[PDB]
Specification:
It is classed as neuropeptide. The protein is mostly helical. Helices cover 50% and strands 0% of the residues.
């Protein structure tokens, strides 16, 4: 269901 990592990390 995709990897939200993309944001999950940019917000870190």
């Amino acid at each position: 269901r995709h990897y939200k990592n993309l944001i999950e990390r940019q917000r870190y």
